[PDB]
Design a protein around this ligand. Sequence first.
Ligand SMILES: *C/C=C(C)/C=C/C=C(C)/C=C/C1=C(C)CCCC1(C)C
Ligand SMILES: CCCCCCCCCC
Ligand SMILES: CCCCCCCCCC
Ligand SMILES: CCCCCCCCCC
Ligand SMILES: CCCCCCCCCC
Ligand SMILES: CCCCCCCCCC
Ligand SMILES: CCCCCCCC
Ligand SMILES: CCCCCCCC
Length: 226
Amino acid sequence: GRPEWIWLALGTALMGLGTLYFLVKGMGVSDPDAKKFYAITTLVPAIAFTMYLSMLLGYGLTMVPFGGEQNPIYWARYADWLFTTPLLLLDLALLVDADQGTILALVGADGIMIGTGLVGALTKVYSYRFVWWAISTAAMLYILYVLFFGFTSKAESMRPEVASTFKVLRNVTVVLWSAYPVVWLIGSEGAGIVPLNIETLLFMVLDVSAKVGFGLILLRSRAIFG
Ligand SMILES: *C/C=C(C)/C=C/C=C(C)/C=C/C1=C(C)CCCC1(C)C
Ligand SMILES: CCCCCCCCCC
Ligand SMILES: CCCCCCCCCC
Ligand SMILES: CCCCCCCCCC
Ligand SMILES: CCCCCCCCCC
Ligand SMILES: CCCCCCCCCC
Ligand SMILES: CCCCCCCC
Ligand SMILES: CCCCCCCC
């Protein structure tokens, strides 16, 4: 009955509800272009659901030795993020009709973010934890650079409802993604300052907002209709 359980339970509920709602809504859409966004965006909280549920049940948790202590690390988060973060970038890329090469590069930079963040979460040499964290944060900053300079630029050729929706999602994304590396740095994977219960509450708010909040905004806009 670990104290962070409550936040995993509430994350499981919120992700489950969001998945359902988005499914119900997506089932009623016939527009070809809109259906693709629904599929992708319903899949995202679905995957987060399974991983929050897993973590609630005590899977995806391992102890890593570093700084003279056994430290609890939820690796299940990375299995979620490995698929969900590129799917959220895909939403944004299809919105602004980004080029296939840009999408490859993003997904590739995202895989590297997640994978190097994983390696760092599992690293036993304390200082090497932060080498992997820095490389991960670099890859995240490449992504955000691309969203902000590349996509915004592209979105500016599009219809106003597309440009407006993109900007909102881009802003939500940059604010919430940028908070992840900070939480990791001060939390249990990092400096150990913020306790695991509070850290789990923080990832909860950020994940729900970055998937369900993002989703509500995207799927209720007129921008997804071709
Ligand atoms: C839906 C879940 C989302 C949108 C999660 C996004 C997560 C990140 C942007 C995490 C980034 C990380 C780094 C910048 C550095 C090292 C650790 C990570 C994986 C937490
Ligand atoms: C289930 C994921 C479906 C997303 C399709 C996106 C295709 C890109 C344009 C052809
Ligand atoms: C244009 C296609 C790029 C191929 C993958 C490169 C990923 C490197 C991270 C910048
Ligand atoms: C450490 C910060 C890394 C920033 C990457 C620069 C983006 C590439 C522009 C083409
Ligand atoms: C050129 C170095 C890139 C690092 C900055 C990332 C900017 C994020 C845009 C919101
Ligand atoms: C255009 C403004 C979009 C909203 C971004 C604010 C995110 C706040 C996170 C708590
Ligand atoms: C302790 C040495 C840091 C290694 C640099 C990481 C990029 C290759
Ligand atoms: C969004 C990540 C910013 C770069 C590291 C910030 C650590 C305070």
